[PDB]
Symmetry: C7
Subunit: 71 residues, 7 copies
Amino acid sequence: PRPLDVLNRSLKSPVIVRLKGGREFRGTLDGYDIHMNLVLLDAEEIQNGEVVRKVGSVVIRGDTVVFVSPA
Amino acid sequence: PPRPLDVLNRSLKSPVIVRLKGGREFRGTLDGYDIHMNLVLLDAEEIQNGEVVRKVGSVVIRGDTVVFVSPAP
Amino acid sequence: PRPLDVLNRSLKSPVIVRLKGGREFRGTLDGYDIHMNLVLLDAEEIQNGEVVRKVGSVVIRGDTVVFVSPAP
Amino acid sequence: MPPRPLDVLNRSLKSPVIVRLKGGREFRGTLDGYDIHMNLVLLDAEEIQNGEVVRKVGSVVIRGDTVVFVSPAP
Amino acid sequence: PRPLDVLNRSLKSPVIVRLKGGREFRGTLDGYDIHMNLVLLDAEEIQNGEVVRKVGSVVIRGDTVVFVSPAP
Amino acid sequence: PRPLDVLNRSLKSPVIVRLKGGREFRGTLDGYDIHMNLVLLDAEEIQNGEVVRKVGSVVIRGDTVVFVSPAPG
Amino acid sequence: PRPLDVLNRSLKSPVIVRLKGGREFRGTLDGYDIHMNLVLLDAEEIQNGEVVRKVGSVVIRGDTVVFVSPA
Ligand SMILES: O=c1ccn([C@@H]2O[C@H](CO)[C@@H](O)[C@H]2O)c(=O)[nH]1
Ligand SMILES: O=c1ccn([C@@H]2O[C@H](CO)[C@@H](O)[C@H]2O)c(=O)[nH]1
Ligand SMILES: O=c1ccn([C@@H]2O[C@H](CO)[C@@H](O)[C@H]2O)c(=O)[nH]1
């Protein structure tokens, strides 16, 4: 298929997003686009196992993503 | 289905926190934005892992610098 | 053979992907695209040539990739 | 219920501004112009590293790429 | 007198591909495209004189390449 | 598109260029182009304010530039 | 008065290429393109001032160039 297809197959389901530099985000994938900018709902920022803050929602720049996976 | 830029829009005039590469944060009112994700914040504060470094009437942030944007309160 | 061509010749077969900084993955190449983003089913993250974890599947930003090679 | 990023930049032509470059340094000068890329031109400006003035220049042309943020300095 | 041309005049011949970071690859140039992505057959990964891997073939993102040269 | 104009107003006049990282150049601006690649004549590589080496001319990649500023002195 | 024109005025002549990261290249400029990719003939990879390697020729990714100079 197309990687963007699998992304769409994950809408409304939980996911794990990895970022350059080390940090991770966990939550519900709401939307996305050709830049791979992502939108998460009810998410936690994670650094080396420990949470570093919760957020009602976030908009991440695709240019910061390494990979995304379902949980 | 809901898209990134859309959510930004749904947040114009309200307060937001902008993360940046390196670690410096910003808190202010999202005034505007363009397609390359540049941002415009009014009455914002630069945040150094905790404390406040500077306060500005307004600020024009390069999109290429942002890591994420989150609605505050 | 075109770079993108050789990749296609591997759809469904196992592969190893190496990202900038070390992180290596091992799984089935499900799909790809222009930019070179990749989708991998049933795969394991491997920085140190061993096994560090597993993930039903993953979508990788082509920007992150260094190389892709068929896992004999 | 207005703006755009490039607009606010225009709304500062001829006024003093603070420019934050990637790395750490900064520039303080009169915003003379800009463009799509977001390249900037500054007049009678100073380079500043962690507080100290490192050099004064008649004017400077800053590659958009280098910029982190621009703000009007009141 | 055309970087990509030189690359072409080496298909099927042995080459040295230097990546960013320090690592290297020695193998047979198979394919290539506009971006400068490469395809190598029967290659070995090299880090400061030592072989860290042998592979049937590899697809290298142009983005990673520092340089490519022929080896008699 | 005014920055590119300023560069033009300096063609043949001396200038100082700074590249991402730290290296600085001083010489006569000869040419330039959309991308911001530059051509300098009789230039010198610099640190701490003065001379460190010389080159009849150099072609810098716009991708490497941080800033250019006209400088007789 | 155009960068790419100066390169061309150096075809078949010795040049020095400085790449990000530190290392340099010395050799005869053979070719180049819009991406400023370069081709060198009979070149040496110099590091910290020591000849670190000789090659019959190299194709240097433009993206890795800092600057090119004659003589
Ligand atoms: O003179 C130029 C040419 C390009 N760019 C911008 O720099 C980036 C490429 O490094 C692109 O966003 C491009 O728009 C500039 O800032 N100035
Ligand atoms: O010869 C070139 C080609 C591109 N670029 C710049 O590098 C950016 C991305 O590498 C391009 O958008 C362009 O602004 C250069 O500096 N020199
Ligand atoms: O074969 C290629 C393809 C792209 N680039 C340039 O390298 C940069 C990659 O970020 C971009 O400016 C692009 O124009 C090259 O140097 N060579």
